[model samples]
Structure formats: C-alpha cells, structure tokens
Target: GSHMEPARVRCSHLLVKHSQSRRPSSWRQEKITRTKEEALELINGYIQKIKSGEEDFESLASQFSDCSSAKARGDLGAFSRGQMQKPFEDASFALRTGEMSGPVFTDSGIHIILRTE
Candidate 1:
C-alpha cells in the first residue's frame, strides 16, 4: 500500500517572463521585452481576473503562462520542499489546497501559484 503523506505537494503556476528574468525567454516568446514592473502589473491583472471569476487557472495558464508547464495546464506535479526556488516554494507551501497566490517572483519570472495538493 502507498503511504499517505503531506511531504509532497502538487502545484500549478502561471509564469510571465520579462526583460530582467534570468532567462528572459519562454516558449511563448523568444524575445521577452517587458520590464519587471510590466510583468508584475500584467500578472496582477491576471490575478484580478481569477478573483473576479473571469477565468480559471488551467485555461488561463495554458493560454498565457510563460512557463513551459503551460502545456500541462501549468501543472508542476508533486514535489518536496527545496526542489523549487525559495520564493516559489514558500508561496506554494503556504497556500491551502485549492488556494491561489498573488504574484510571486523568482529568477525565472513572476508566478501565480495554485496549490492543488
């Protein structure tokens, strides 16, 4: 039988890359030109849409998320602590299941995280 444990958490995230991102590129765009401020503002708008019930994470992430996980509906699957960047990890771990986060920044970009497990 499989052991039941909370040690592994599953999350989905929508990332937006910008000019100052560590890689500055994503599957959606080869040349990311938006400034960090632009990225943040854009993500904030996404958050508003979600909060207002105008969109859901899966559809929105697949359509507009900059991370390659967009192809998987932003699913990052299951992971343990320390596997993700600190800021991302903290935000993911802090949320209750089914909870969504605000813009969380990492070297890769800004993220809106959804804790699924």
Candidate 2:
C-alpha cells in the first residue's frame, strides 16, 4: 500500500547573467524597433524548429546560449521547487511529460525547454 498527497512548492533561481549587450551609462534607452523585433522573431522561429523536431536542443544550446551551463549542453540537471529563478523554475515545473514549453524570455535570453523527469 502507498499513501499519496498533493502539495504545492516554491522555486527560486539566480540571475547569473544577462544575455543582451551591455550599454554605457550615458546611453539613453532608445527603442530599437528592428533589433527587438528581430529578436522576438528569432524566438518564434526557434520555437517552431524545436516543436517540429528539426532542432537538436543540446547542440543549439551549446552553440547559441550565453549561459555557462551551455558547456553541459544546457543540462541544468534536476531542480526542485525553490531551486531556480521565478520564470525558469515556474516554466520548467509547469511542463507536462514528453511536452516542451513555450518560449520563455528571461534575462538570459529566450529558452525553449523540455522536461526530463
């Protein structure tokens, strides 16, 4: 016999770095329509490729990700609640088995994630 319970948990993550290019202090926050649009567009394209099974996640992360974990093929390993950043932790936990998450735009850039449980 086994006892089962339902419960909720909290997750936390460190913002190790920002993916965007750093600007000088004197630089004004002028909107760059083209760049911002392009980035967003790229995000969509990447997500499509991932969903279509045409992209290799590990390889993509290794080549394009700015995170140090990129070296591990973006293998963040197992994470419990309260172990990752708000956005990442939430997104990672919300995924269903054998299902991928939508594009998550964090300070680290866009991420198309898969759940490996």
Candidate 3:
C-alpha cells in the first residue's frame, strides 16, 4: 500500500516578517528591523496565546500577520503542493484538521499555519 494525502489543503496562517525577509514591509511595519530570533520569540508568544485560549487565532492573525491574507484573518484558502513555499506546504499537508503548526520559516518570514481542512 502507498501513503495517501489530499490533493489540496485549506489553511490560514500567521506570518511575522523580520529584517531579513525578502520584503520586510508589512501592514504593521513599513520597515521591519527585528532579528529572526526576535521574530521567532514574537511568533512563539502568539502560539502560546492561541494554544492557551488567551487569544483567538483569527484575531491575532488579522492584527499581526505580515501577509496580505491578514485582511481575511490569515486565510490562504485552498492550495496544492506547488503553490506554497516548501516549508509551508509541507507543514500544512502534515497537519490534521484544526491543527496549528509550530513556526515554519520561509524566504518571506516565519509562519504558523492553521490547517482548516
């Protein structure tokens, strides 16, 4: 038998861009100056908040995510393998429904993926 995976996955994600990101400007910051480690710390805090029920993922995603999908509560909708960066795609596909990934790094920045479907 062979392993089976979905042809597409639906996801929402929270992105935090550091100074070294390919394009560091975001809706929140015109010029990002934090180090990658700093960004990691920030993302980890958000993850803690979400996991501990202190904050809603959607609310945090909209307010803090560097990606334009923040406008839609970090919704990236459905995507197939080749559509997303390798780290993001791998993490999303690996998740079970309603699971959130640990911080995933891409050229754009660090992200926390929520597998919605």
Candidate 4:
C-alpha cells in the first residue's frame, strides 16, 4: 500500500500524575479518580472555548496538549486511514478544514480535537 501521512489530529489534554510509593492505597485510587476527572474537565473546557468562537487551535494545543505532537502544535504529520484508533480516524477524516471534532474518548483519555486539510 502507498504510504500516506499519519492521520493527523490536533488536540490537547490535562494530565495528572500521582506519586505511587509516597501514598497509601487510597491515595492511588484517589489519583486515578482525580486524573480522570481533570481530563474530562479539561476536555470540556476546551470544547466550550471552541464553541465560543475561540479557534486558536495551535496556541491551545501547545498550551494544554500532553501528546508529543503538542510540541508541533498538535500536528501529527499525517497517515493513511485506519492507521489511527477508530474513533480518532473517523473524526479526523470526517471533519473539514479548520473544523474541530471532540471530546471523543479513547484508551489514552479524553481529547479536544481539530481537523485540517
């Protein structure tokens, strides 16, 4: 098959890390819970920001993204269809340039996303 660009996604996330050895069993649970909660909060907040006419995708991605592509302003380069996770690939290909697509959930966590040509 021909090599295509990776399915590029523009996104951002909030990551919460817990100190495992420094805390009790309950602390581990709490950390997991808090991370999930904060991830959701960050995703939702980004959604609201986009909906409210704030479309600075690169700036937002750079500031809040946890993925390595965040270093490139959420530019994942590109890839063939089906190369990315189903949810991500579907959303990215379905969007028009300058359009955004998430709070889509995946194994990694929540995502705030944009699609581009």
Among these predictions, the greatest lDDT belongs to 3
* Global lDDT of each candidate: 0.85, 0.52, 0.86, 0.56
What TM-score do all the candidates reach, one by one? 0.89, 0.65, 0.90, 0.64
Tell me the deviation in Å of residue 54 in model 2: 1.4
Candidate 3, residues 4-68: lDDT per residue as tens digits?
77787888888888998789898788998998999999999998898899988889888888788
Candidate 2 clashes between residue pairs 3 or more apart in a chain or in different chains? 10-82, 11-82, 12-82, 12-84, 13-84, 13-85
Candidate 4 Cα misplacement greater than 4 A, ranges: 1-33
- Candidate 3: stretches off by over 4 Å: 1-4
Q: Predict model 1's lDDT versus the native.
A: 0.85
Off by over 4 Å in 1: 1-5
Query: Model 1: per-residue lDDT, tens digit, 22-114?
Result: 787678888788988888998999999988999888998997877888778989898988888799988888887889889898778888888
Model 2, poorest ten-residue lDDT window?
10-19
User: Ten-residue segment with the worst summed lDDT in candidate 4?
Assistant: 15-24
For each of the candidates, give the backbone clash count.
Answer: 0, 6, 0, 5
**Model 2 lDDT tens row, 1-117:** 543422332221111222243421111223222344455666677668867888676766665444444656666665566756677767876765456666676654555666644
Q: Comparing 1 and 2 by lDDT, which wins?
A: 1
**Cα RMSDs, all models:** 3.6, 7.1, 1.9, 7.1
RMSD of 3: 1.9
